[PDB]
PDB file of C-alpha atoms in Angstrom:
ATOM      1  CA  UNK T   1      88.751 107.235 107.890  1.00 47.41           C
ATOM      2  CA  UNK T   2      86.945 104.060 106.344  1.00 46.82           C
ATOM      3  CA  UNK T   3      86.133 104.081 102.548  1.00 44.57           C
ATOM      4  CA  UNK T   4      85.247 101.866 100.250  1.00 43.13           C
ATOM      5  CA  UNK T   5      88.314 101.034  97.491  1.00 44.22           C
ATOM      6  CA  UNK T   6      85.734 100.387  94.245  1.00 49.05           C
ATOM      7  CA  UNK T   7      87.804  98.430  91.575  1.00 51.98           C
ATOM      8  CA  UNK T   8      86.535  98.224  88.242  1.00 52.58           C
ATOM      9  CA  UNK T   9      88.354  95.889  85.576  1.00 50.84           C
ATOM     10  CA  UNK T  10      87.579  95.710  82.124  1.00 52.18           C
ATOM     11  CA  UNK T  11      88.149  96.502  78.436  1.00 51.37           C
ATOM     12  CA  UNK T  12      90.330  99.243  77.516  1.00 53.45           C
ATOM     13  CA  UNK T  13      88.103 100.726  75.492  1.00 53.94           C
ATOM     14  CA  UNK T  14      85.239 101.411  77.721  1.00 51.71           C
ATOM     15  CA  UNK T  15      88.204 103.687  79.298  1.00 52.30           C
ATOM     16  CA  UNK T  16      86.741 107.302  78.618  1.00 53.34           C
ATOM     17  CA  UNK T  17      82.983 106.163  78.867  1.00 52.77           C
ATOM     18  CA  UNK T  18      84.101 104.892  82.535  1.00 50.72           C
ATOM     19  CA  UNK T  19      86.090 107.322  83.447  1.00 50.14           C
ATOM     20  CA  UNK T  20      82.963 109.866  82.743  1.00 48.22           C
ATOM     21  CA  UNK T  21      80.660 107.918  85.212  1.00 49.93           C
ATOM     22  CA  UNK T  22      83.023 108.082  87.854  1.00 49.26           C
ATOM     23  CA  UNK T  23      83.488 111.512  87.009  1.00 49.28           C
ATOM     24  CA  UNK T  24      80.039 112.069  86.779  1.00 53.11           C
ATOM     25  CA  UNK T  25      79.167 110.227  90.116  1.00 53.58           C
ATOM     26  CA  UNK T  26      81.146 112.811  92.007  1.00 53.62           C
ATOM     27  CA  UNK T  27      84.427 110.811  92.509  1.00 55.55           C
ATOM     28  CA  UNK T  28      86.871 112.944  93.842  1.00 56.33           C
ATOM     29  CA  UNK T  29      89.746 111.306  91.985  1.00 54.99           C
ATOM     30  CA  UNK T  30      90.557 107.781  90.268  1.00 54.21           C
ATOM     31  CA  UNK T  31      93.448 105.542  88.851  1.00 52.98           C
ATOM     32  CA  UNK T  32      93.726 103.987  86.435  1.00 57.01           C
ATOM     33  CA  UNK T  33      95.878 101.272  85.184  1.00 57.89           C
ATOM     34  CA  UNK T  34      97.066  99.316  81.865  1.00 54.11           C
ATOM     35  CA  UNK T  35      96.405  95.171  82.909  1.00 53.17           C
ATOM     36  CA  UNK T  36      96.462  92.007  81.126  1.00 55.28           C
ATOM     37  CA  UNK T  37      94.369  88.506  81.599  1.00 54.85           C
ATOM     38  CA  UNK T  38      92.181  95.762  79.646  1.00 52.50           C
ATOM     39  CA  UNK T  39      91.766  98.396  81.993  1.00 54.22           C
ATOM     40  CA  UNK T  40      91.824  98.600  85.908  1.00 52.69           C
ATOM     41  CA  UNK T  41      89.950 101.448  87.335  1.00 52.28           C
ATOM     42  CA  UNK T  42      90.645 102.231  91.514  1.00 53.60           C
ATOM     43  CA  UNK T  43      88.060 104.422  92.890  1.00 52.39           C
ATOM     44  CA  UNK T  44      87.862 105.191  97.026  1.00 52.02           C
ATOM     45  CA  UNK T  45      84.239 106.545  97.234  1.00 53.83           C
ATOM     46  CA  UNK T  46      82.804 108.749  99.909  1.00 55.30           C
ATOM     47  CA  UNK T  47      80.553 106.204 101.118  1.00 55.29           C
ATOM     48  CA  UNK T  48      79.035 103.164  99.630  1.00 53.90           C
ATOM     49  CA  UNK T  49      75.893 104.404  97.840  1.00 52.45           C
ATOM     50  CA  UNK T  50      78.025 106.292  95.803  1.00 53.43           C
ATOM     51  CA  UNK T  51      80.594 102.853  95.245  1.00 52.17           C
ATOM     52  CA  UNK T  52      77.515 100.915  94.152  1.00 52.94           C
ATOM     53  CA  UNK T  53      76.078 103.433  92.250  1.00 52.59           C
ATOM     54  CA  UNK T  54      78.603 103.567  89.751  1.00 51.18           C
ATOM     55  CA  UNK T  55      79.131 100.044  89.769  1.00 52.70           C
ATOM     56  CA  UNK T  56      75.563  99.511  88.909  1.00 50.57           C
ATOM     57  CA  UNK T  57      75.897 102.231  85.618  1.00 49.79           C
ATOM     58  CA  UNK T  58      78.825 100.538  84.718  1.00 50.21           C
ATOM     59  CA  UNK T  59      77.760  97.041  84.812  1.00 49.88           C
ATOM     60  CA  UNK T  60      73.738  97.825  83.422  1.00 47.61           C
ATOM     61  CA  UNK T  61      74.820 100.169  80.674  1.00 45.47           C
ATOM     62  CA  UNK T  62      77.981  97.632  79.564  1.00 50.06           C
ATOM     63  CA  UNK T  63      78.157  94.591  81.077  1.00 53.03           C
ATOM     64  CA  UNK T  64      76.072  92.632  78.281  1.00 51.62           C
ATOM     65  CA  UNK T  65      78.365  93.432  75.643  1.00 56.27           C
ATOM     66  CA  UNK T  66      81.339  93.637  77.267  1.00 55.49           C
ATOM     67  CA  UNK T  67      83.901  91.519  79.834  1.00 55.69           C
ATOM     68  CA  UNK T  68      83.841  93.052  82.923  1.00 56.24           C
ATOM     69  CA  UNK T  69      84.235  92.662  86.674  1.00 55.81           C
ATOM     70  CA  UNK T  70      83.468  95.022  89.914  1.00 54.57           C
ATOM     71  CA  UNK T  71      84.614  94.744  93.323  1.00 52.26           C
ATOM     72  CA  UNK T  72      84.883  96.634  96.559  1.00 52.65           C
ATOM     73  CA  UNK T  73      87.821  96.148  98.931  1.00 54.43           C
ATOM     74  CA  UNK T  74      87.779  97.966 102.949  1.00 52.59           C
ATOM     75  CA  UNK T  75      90.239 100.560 102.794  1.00 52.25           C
ATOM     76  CA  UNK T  76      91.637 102.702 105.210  1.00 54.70           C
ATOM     77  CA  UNK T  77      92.791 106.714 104.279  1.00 54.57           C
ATOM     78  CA  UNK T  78      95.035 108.209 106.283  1.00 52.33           C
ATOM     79  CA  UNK T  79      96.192 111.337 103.818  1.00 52.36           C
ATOM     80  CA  UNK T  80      94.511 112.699 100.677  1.00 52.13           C
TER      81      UNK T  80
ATOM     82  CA  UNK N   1     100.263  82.722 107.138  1.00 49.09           C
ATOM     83  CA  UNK N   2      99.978  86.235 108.517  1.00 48.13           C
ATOM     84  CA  UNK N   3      98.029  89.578 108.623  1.00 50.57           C
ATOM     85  CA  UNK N   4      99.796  92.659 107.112  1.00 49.81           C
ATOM     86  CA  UNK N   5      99.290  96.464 106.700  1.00 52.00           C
ATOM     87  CA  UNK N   6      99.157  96.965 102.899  1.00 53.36           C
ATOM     88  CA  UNK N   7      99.845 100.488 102.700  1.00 55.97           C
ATOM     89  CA  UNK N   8      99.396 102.210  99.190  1.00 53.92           C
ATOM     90  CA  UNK N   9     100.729 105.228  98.266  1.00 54.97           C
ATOM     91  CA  UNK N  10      99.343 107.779  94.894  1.00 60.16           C
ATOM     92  CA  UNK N  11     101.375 111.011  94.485  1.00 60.29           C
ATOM     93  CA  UNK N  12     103.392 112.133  91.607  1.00 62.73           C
ATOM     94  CA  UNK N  13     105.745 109.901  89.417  1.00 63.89           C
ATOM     95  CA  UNK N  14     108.234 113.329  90.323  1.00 60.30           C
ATOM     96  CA  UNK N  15     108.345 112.348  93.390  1.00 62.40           C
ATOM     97  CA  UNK N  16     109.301 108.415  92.672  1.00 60.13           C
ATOM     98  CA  UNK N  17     113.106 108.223  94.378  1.00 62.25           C
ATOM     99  CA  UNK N  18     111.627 110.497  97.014  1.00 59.91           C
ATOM    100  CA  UNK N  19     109.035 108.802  98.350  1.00 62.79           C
ATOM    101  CA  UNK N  20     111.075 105.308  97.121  1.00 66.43           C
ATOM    102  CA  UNK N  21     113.687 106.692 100.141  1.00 69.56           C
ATOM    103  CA  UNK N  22     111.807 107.412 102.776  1.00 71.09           C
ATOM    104  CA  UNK N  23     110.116 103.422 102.169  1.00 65.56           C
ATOM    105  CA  UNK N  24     113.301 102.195 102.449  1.00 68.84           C
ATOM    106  CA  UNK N  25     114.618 103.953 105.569  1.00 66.36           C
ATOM    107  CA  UNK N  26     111.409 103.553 107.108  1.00 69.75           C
ATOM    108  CA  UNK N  27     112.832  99.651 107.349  1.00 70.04           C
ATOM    109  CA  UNK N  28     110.408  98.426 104.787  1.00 67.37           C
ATOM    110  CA  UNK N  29     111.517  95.139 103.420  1.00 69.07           C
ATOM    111  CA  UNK N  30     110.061  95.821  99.849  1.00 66.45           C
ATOM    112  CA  UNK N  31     107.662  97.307  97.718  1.00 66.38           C
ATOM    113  CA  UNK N  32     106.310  97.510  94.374  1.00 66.85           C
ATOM    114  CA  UNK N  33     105.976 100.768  92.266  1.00 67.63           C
ATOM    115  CA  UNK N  34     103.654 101.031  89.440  1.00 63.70           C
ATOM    116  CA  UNK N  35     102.581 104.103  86.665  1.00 59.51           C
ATOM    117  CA  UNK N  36      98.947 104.990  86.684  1.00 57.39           C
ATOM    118  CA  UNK N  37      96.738 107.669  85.342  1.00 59.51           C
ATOM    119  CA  UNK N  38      93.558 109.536  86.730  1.00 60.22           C
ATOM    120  CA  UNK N  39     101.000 109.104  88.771  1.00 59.31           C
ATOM    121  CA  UNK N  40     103.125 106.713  90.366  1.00 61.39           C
ATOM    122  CA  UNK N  41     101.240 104.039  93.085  1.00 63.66           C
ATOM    123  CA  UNK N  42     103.136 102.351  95.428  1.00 65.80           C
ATOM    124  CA  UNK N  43     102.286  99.430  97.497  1.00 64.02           C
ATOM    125  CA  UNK N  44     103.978  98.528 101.042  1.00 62.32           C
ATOM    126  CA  UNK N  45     103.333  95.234 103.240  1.00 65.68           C
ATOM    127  CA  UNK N  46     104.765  96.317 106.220  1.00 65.98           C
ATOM    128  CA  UNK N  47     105.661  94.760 109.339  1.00 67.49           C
ATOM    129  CA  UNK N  48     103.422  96.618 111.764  1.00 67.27           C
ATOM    130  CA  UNK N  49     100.979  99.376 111.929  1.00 65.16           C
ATOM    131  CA  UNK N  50     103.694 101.924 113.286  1.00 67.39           C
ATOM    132  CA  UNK N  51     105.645 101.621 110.144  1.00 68.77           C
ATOM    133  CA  UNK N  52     102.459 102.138 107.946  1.00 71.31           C
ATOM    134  CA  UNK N  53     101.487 105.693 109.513  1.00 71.50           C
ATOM    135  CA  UNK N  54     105.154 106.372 109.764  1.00 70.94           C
ATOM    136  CA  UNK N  55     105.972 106.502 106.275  1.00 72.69           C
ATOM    137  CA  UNK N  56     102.808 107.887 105.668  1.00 74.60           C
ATOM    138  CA  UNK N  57     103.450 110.777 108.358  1.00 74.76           C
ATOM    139  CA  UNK N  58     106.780 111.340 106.364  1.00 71.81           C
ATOM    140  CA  UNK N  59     105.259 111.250 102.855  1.00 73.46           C
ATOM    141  CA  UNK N  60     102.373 113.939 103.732  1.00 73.45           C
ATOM    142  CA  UNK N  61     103.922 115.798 105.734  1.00 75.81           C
ATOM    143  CA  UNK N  62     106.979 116.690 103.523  1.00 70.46           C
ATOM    144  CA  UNK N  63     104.797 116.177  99.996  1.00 69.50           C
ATOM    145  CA  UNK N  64     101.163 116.777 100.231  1.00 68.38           C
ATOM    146  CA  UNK N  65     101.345 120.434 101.162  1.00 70.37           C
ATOM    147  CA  UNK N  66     103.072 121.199  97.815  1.00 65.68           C
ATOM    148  CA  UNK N  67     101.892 118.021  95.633  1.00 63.58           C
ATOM    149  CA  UNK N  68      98.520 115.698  95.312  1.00 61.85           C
ATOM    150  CA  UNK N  69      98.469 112.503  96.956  1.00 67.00           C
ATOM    151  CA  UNK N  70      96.592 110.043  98.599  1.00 65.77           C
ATOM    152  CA  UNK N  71      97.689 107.319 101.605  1.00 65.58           C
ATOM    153  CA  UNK N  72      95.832 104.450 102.583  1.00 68.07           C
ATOM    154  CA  UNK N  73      95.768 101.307 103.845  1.00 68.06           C
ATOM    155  CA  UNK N  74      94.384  97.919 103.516  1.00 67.48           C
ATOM    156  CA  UNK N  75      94.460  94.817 105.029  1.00 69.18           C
ATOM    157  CA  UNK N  76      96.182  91.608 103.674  1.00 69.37           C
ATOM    158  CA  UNK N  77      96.936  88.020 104.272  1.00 67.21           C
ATOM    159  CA  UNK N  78     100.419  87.515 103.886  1.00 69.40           C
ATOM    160  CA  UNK N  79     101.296  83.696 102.771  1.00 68.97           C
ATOM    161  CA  UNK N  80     104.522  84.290 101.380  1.00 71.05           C
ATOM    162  CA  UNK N  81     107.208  86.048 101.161  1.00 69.33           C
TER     163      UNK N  81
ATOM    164  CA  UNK U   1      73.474  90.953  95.045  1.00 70.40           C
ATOM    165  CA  UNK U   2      77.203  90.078  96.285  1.00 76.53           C
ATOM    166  CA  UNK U   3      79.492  87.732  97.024  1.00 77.78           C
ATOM    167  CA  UNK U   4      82.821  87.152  99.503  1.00 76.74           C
ATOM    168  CA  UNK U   5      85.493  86.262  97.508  1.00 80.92           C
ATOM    169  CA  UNK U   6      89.715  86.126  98.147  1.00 76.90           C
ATOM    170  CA  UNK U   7      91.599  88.275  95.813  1.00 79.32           C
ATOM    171  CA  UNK U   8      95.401  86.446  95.739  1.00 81.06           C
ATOM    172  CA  UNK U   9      98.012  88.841  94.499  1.00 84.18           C
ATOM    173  CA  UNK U  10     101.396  87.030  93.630  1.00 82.17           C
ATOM    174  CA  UNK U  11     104.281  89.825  92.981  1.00 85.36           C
ATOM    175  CA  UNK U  12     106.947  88.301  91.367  1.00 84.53           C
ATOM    176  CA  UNK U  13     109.976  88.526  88.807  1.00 82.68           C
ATOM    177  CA  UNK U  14     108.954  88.884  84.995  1.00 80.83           C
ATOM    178  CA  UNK U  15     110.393  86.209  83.751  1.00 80.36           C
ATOM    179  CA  UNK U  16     107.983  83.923  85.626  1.00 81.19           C
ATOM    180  CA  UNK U  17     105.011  85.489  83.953  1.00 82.42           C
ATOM    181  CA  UNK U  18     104.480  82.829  81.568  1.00 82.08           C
ATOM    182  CA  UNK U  19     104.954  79.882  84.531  1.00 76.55           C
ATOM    183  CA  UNK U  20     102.791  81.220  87.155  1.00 78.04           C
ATOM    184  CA  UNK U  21     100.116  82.235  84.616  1.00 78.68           C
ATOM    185  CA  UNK U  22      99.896  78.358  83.887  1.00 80.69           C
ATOM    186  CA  UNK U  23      99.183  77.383  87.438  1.00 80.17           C
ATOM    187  CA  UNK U  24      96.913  80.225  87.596  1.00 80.63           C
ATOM    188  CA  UNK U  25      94.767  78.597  85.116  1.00 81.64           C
ATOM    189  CA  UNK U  26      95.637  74.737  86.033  1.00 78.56           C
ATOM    190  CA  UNK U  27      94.259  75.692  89.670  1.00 81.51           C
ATOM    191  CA  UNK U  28      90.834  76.336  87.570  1.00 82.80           C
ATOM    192  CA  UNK U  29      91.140  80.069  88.394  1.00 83.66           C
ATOM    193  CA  UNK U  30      88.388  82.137  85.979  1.00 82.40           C
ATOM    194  CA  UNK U  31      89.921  84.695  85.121  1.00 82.40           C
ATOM    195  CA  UNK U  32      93.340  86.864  86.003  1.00 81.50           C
ATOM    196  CA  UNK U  33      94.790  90.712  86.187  1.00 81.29           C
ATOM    197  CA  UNK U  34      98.830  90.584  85.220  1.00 80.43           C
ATOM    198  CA  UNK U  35     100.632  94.130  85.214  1.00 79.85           C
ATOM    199  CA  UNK U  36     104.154  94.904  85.000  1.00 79.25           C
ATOM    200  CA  UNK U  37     105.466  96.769  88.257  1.00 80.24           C
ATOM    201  CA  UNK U  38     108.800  98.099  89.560  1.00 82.19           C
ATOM    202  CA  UNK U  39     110.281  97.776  93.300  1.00 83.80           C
ATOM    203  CA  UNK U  40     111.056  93.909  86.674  1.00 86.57           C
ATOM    204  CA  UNK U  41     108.349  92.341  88.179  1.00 87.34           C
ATOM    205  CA  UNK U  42     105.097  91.427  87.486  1.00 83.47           C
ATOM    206  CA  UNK U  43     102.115  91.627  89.542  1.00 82.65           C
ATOM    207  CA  UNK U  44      99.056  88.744  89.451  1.00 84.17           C
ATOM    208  CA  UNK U  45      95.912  88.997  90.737  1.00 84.90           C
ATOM    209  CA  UNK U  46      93.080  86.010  90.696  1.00 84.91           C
ATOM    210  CA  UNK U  47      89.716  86.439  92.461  1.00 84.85           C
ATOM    211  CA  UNK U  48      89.551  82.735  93.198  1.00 82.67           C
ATOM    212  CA  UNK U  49      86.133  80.738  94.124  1.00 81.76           C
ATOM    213  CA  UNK U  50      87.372  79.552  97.287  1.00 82.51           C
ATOM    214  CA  UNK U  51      90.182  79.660 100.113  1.00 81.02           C
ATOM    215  CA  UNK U  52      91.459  76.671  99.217  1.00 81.44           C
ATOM    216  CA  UNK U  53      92.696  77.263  95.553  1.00 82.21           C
ATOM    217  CA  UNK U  54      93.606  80.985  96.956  1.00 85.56           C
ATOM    218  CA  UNK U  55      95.998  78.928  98.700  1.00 86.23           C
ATOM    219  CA  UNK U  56      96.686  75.625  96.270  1.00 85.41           C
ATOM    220  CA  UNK U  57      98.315  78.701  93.325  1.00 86.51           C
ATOM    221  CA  UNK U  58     100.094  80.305  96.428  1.00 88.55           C
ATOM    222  CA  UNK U  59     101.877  76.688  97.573  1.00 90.28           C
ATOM    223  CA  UNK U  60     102.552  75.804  93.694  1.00 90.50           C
ATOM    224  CA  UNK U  61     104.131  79.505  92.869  1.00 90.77           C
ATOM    225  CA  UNK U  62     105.794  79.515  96.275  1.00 86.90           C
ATOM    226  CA  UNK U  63     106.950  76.015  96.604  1.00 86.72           C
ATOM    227  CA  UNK U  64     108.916  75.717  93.000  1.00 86.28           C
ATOM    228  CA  UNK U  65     109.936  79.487  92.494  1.00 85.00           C
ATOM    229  CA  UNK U  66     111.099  81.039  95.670  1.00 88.30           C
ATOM    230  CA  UNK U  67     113.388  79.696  96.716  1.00 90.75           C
ATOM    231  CA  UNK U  68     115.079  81.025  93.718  1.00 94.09           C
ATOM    232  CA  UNK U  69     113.156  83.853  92.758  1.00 96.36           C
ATOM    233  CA  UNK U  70     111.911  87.052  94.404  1.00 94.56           C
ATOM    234  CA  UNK U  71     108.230  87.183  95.244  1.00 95.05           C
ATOM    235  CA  UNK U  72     105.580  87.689  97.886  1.00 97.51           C
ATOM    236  CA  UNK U  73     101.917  86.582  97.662  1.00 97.75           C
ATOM    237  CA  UNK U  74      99.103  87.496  99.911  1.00 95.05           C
ATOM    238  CA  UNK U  75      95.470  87.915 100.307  1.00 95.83           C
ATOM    239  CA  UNK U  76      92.847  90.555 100.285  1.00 96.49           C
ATOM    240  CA  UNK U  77      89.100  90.006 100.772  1.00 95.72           C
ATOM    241  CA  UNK U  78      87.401  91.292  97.712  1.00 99.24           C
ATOM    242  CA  UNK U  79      83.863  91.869  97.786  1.00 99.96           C
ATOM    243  CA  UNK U  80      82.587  90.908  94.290  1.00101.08           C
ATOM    244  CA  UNK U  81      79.751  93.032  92.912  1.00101.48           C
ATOM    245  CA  UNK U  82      79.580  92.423  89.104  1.00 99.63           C
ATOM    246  CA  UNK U  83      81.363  89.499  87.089  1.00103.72           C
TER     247      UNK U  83
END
């Protein structure tokens, strides 16, 4: 099945308040990583609504005072 | 340059040398292993599309009824290595 | 609003972390991810503007490391949203 692989990079501190809207948003599941250049959140979303969704939360509600970036990447599951 | 499975792999950091085996008698020529929260992620290039659902066959099929996981794939653009 | 861009991940030993990250930013590259990862190594990964410096930091790294050291580099569309 096709998803949508939502990665969301930024600072380490936004980690809980992140992790909540992807939570929130009705993510099944997340990782998350330690990254220099900071946080790296992975995120396969049911569809794409829900990928852009919590891109747009995180970006509108932190993105003006804080270094970010958001991106989607085609993935493909085959178990989980 | 050429195009690639990149097969990634979320269980368990218990089951590191497990799954780590089954990658390497699969025939894969390498991988890298990282710790993550939400773990252990893998990530495979492999030759072909066989190999990808092959390990991935092996890993859910022996793992996933007893532990969490998640398989996927994506597609990459292999200049070197 | 969106935009296409090449995500170039360069996995390679750690004690090239230093090296690559300069040709990283002498290709003009933004901005960079760099994690440590088993298989130690270290992983990169550069959203870059274009193709062409995608592939001007993958000749450099490739070119005059590896023939000595381990590594692989490759590319994965990235479809950036925010940033």
């Amino acid at each position: 099945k096709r998803a949508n692989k939502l990665v969301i990079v930024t600072e380490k501190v936004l980690l809980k308040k992140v992790a909540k809207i992807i939570e929130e948003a009705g993510a099944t599941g997340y990782t998350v990583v330690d990254t220099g250049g900071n946080v790296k959140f992975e995120v396969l979303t049911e569809n794409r609504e829900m990928a852009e969704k919590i891109a747009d939360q995180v970006a509108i509600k932190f993105f003006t005072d804080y270094a970010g970036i958001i991106y989607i990447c085609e993935a493909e599951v085959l178990y989980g």
